[PDB]
Amino acid sequence: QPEPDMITIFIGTWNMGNAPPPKKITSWFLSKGQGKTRDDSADYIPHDIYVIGTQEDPLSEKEWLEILKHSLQEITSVTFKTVAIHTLWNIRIVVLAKPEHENRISHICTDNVKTGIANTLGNKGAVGVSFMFNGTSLGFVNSHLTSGSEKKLRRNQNYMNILRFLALGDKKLSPFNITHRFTHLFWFGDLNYRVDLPTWEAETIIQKIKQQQYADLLSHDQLLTERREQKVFLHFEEEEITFAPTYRFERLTRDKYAYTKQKATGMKYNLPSWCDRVLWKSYPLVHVVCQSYGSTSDIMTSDHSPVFATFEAGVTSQFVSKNGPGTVDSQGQIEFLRCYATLKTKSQTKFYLEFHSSCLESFVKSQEGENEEGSEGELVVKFGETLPKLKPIISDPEYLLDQHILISIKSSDSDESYGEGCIALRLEATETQLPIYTPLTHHGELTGHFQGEIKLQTSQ
Numbered sequence: 001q002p003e004p005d006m007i008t009i010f011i012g013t014w015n016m017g018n019a020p021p022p023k024k025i026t027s028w029f030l031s032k033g034q035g036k037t038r039d040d041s042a043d044y045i046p047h048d049i050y051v052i053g054t055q056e057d058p059l060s061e062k063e064w065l066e067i068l069k070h071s072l073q074e075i076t077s078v079t080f081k082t083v084a085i086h087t088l089w090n091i092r093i094v095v096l097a098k099p100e101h102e103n104r105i106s107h108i109c110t111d112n113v114k115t116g117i118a119n120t121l122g123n124k125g126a127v128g129v130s131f132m133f134n135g136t137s138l139g140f141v142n143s144h145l146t147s148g149s150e151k152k153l154r155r156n157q158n159y160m161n162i163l164r165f166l167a168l169g170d171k172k173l174s175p176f177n178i179t180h181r182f183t184h185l186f187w188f189g190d191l192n193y194r195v196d197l198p199t200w201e202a203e204t205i206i207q208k209i210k211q212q213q214y215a216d217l218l219s220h221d222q223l224l225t226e227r228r229e230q231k232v233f234l235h236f237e238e239e240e241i242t243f244a245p246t247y248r249f250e251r252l253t254r255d256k257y258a259y260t261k262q263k264a265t266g267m268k269y270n271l272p273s274w275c276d277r278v279l280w281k282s283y284p285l286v287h288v289v290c291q292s293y294g295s296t297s298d299i300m301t302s303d304h305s306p307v308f309a310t311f312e313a314g315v316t317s318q319f320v321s322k323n324g325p326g327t328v329d330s331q332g333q334i335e336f337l338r339c340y341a342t343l344k345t346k347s348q349t350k351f352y353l354e355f356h357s358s359c360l361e362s363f364v365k366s367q368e369g370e371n372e373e374g375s376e377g378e379l380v381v382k383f384g385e386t387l388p389k390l391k392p393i394i395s396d397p398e399y400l401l402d403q404h405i406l407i408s409i410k411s412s413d414s415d416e417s418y419g420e421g422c423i424a425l426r427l428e429a430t431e432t433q434l435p436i437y438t439p440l441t442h443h444g445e446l447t448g449h450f451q452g453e454i455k456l457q458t459s460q
């Protein structure tokens with residue numbers, strides 16, 4: 001029985017509006033409705049992993065697990081295994097996998113983050129799950145961010161708190177937040193970004209939706225505009241949106257958007273918006289392809305419609321050689337030439353690098369770099385040819401070219417990371433000097449760049 005080099009992953013997000021679901025929700029798991037939808041010829045083909053995020057979920061974990069498992073069994077005739085379930089207040093994540101994957105999955109972690117303070121602490125935040133699937137790390141975040149059209153900055157703050165404080169994946173990756181810990185990271189939920197147009201344009205917006213003309217609405221979507229200005233979700237992807245706004249509907253139909261201010265809304269308008277979203281970030285040069293992104297048309301218990309997204313995702317096997325794991329393979333090495341970090345910091349400490357990778361027995365600390373002043377004000381930290389030679393556990397190019405090196409640049413004075421990034425070893429050539437590059441971030445904001453050259457030696 002061969003190990004897979006690809007899997008498919010279903011991501012669902014649904015704000016259930018504190019109402020039980022209807023008796024049939026299979027269209028959600030089949031990616032049928034509006035947008036980029038899944039071919040009918042695939043309906044019986046189970047996804048490898050289903051990740052379900054709910055918000056305003058009124059059900060117990062038991063109640064929802066029974067609905068989800070029975071739904072997937074009806075679709076696929078497969079009885080899925082429960083990988084993980086985690087609930088904060090009414091925010092929930094469920095991970096289900098095909099039974100054949102049970103002994104491919106390990107290191108399962110769950111966590112939550114509560115956003116806000118006092119007033120604004122009590123119902124928003126995020127839940128997440130991570131695990132290893134053979135050689136590949138997978139992370140999943142379901143967030144319910146702050147509501148309201150005039151709170152985009154609060155949503156951006158909620159995002160930064162979640163990526164700082166959600167404790168998933170390998171704790172040995174201490175300088176790295178969740179935006180660097182996984183081969184593939186999926187972040188979804190009721191992110192609550194709105195279409196920023198004047199209230200008076202409500203009926204115009206509805207018109208446009210009825211005509212399936214989304215371009216003039218998407219150009220005012222706060223998540224797309226905030227992402228363009230690098231205010232949030234830096235270095236994440238989202239498929240093009242080709243489905244109608246998923247909020248705010250009258251319940252029990254999809255024929256009506258309920259946008260007008262009511263006591264029940266705190267006298268706020270809810271112009272039609274794409275509140276419910278799926279984004280991802282994968283390590284450089286790993287296969288990931290969105291195969292569906294859309295909303296259901298036939299699930300109408302909530303004022304939100306469910307959103308689905310599906311992905312092909314590259315995975316690797318749990319590699320064993322005669323040497324590593326348990327030793328190094330002297331036929332492998334990773335060298336760095338002419339490397340330098342460019343940092344936005346105004347500080348003057350010395351810096352050193354840490355290299356982290358599951359291709360190393362443990363992380364590697366460099367010597368301090370040499371600080372110079374850039375011609376436009378910047379700090380340039382030069383490592384020259386001084387960086388340590390990295391000794392991978394396995395030299396086989398079928399393993400090594402699939403790996404990645406995480407880099408942290410740390411202050412000698414405080415040992416605090418000023419920037420984190422990632423380099424792929426999926427090179428065009430071995431035993432050849434090749435350019436490398438990563439942006440550096442800290443708390444998910446841009447702090448600098450790392451560039452230089454790499455020389456990778458494999459057993460071939």
Ligand SMILES: N[C@@H]1CCCN(C(=O)CCC(F)(F)F)C1
Pocket residue numbers: 224227228229235236237
């Ligand atoms: N093909 C690259 C993928 C990642 C960043 N890129 C964007 O165009 C981001 C646009 C926005 F505004 F949606 F963020 C380019």
Ligand SMILES: N[C@@H]1CCCN(C(=O)CCC(F)(F)F)C1
Pocket residue numbers: 320321322
């Ligand atoms: N532990 C690995 C499993 C698969 C391939 N391997 C061998 O064939 C080892 C041969 C010898 F001579 F070391 F025993 C190494």
